[PDB]
Amino acid sequence: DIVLTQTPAIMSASLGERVTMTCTANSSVSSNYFHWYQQKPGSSPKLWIYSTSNLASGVPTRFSGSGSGTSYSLTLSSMEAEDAATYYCHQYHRSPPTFGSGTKLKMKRADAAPTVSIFPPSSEQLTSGGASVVCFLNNFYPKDINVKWKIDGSERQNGVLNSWTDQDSKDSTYSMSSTLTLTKDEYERHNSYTCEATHKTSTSPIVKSFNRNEC
Amino acid sequence: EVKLEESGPELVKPGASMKMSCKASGYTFTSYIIHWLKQKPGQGLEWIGYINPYNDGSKYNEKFKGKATLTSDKSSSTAYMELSSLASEDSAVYYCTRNYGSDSLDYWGQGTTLTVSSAKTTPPSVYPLAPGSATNSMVTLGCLVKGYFPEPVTVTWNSGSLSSGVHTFPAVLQSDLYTLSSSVTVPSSTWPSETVTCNVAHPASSTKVDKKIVPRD
Ligand SMILES: *[C@@H]1O[C@H](CO[C@@H]2O[C@@H](C)[C@@H](O)[C@@H](O)[C@@H]2O)[C@@H](O)[C@H](O)[C@H]1NC(C)=O
Ligand SMILES: [K+]
């Protein structure tokens, strides 16, 4: 199980920029049995480069590969939006074949403020004895964001589930969902629920509120 | 067209075993080795072993030679992997893939999501997310998918969503139950005028949900 170390682990590139990523093996591996794969979130890997430098069917010509011995590289002459993905190297010089830890290549783009939307518990959920308040924070960049929940002015930290999408295929922004879940009894003891986002695009939080007396 | 079709997601209890399948079509099954690989969430790929359906010979990662047994059925052009004495760390997506020239992996199955856990298979509750009674040219709606186990769930929308207007968030586990959400942003002239529906499938429990996003009254 020959160790393959990929560097960098994470990197970003603007459109049109040259990108090179490397894979270093702990032992020498024949260039005929060195391959690269691309994987996008939620999908199977795709053969990208075979035997060091041959492009698989359908792979854009802006990609190339090179190397021998222990040092291999995948180069992208011009970063494009559809190239944001994780790339893995693979050696089959010996059994067992092994794969790299991956280089996650991201797309740099212009800053975008989150568009914030808040939703009260559905009448349907309220019959279950639970109550969730949901906040979407959509189409922002960069990924760095902080979300706070306030219940009648006091911060709530317990019962909050946050999840982030990876970069949108089209505009390359991130989105985030924040779900506050309480018991129905606890939910009905308060008036207003506020989700507050802090992001570099605004010195003020971007916020939305829902109050129970308005609905 | 070459296709590798894997069996569905499954939940298995600690200490039991799992057998999953990889159905090959569109080429001569017996002429190509099939590899089986493991991928944990947020990790790279780990090779388990291969099956040569020509001579029924399988080769194993030494790590897996006790736990894994790879077989094939020439009668149905199907390769199988059995994993025995399972524990929580066997939870992963498993791929079958075809060995091509110089042992590159050209065609891949869609993956089988295996969860090993003491928890119970539970179908999702799906809840509509509609704005509170308090509009812009665009309106965001959503659905909240709660209380299910195991992964995965799929969400598809019937809507007038705009460019980069659909976001389905990776599920988060809490206390043996998953929460997932999905948002859709549509022009405000399309809703509540035209019907918007969140369609959720949970293959592990053999359930679906077709939830209409109704405005709050
Ligand atoms: C594999 O290599 C890792 C990185 O070490 C560096 O690169 C290798 C190829 C050598 O040139 C070494 O002198 C370098 O410092 C190691 O961190 C790792 O321990 C190695 N793994 C094993 C199992 O030996
Ligand atoms: K319905």
Residue numbers in the entry:
A (entry chain L): 1 to 27, 27A, 28 to 214
B (entry chain H): 1 to 52, 52A, 53 to 82, 82A, 82B, 82C, 83 to 100, 100A, ...
Copy text from the publication:
The monoclonal antibody N14 is used as a detection antibody in ELISA kits for the human glycoprotein afamin, a member of the albumin family, which has recently gained interest in the capture and stabilization of Wnt signalling proteins, and for its role in metabolic syndrome and papillary thyroid carcinoma. As a rare occurrence, the N14 Fab is N-glycosylated at Asn26L at the onset of the VL1 antigen-binding loop, with the α-1–6 core fucosylated complex glycan facing out of the L1 complementarity-determining region.
We therefore elected to deposit both a conservative model and an ‘enthusiastic’ model of one of the N14 Fab structures and suggest some practical points for maintaining a parsimonious model without unduly restricting experienced model building. To explore the ability of a reasonably experienced crystallographer and the restraint necessary to produce a reasonably ‘clean’ PDB validation report, we refined and deposited the N14C3 model optimistically (meaning that we extended our interpretative freedom to lower density levels while at the same time not introducing obviously conjectural or wrong model features) and with more parsimonious restraints, attempting to obtain a validation report with a reasonably achievable minimum of outliers. The arguable compromise we selected is to show the actual density and a possible but not unique model in Figs.
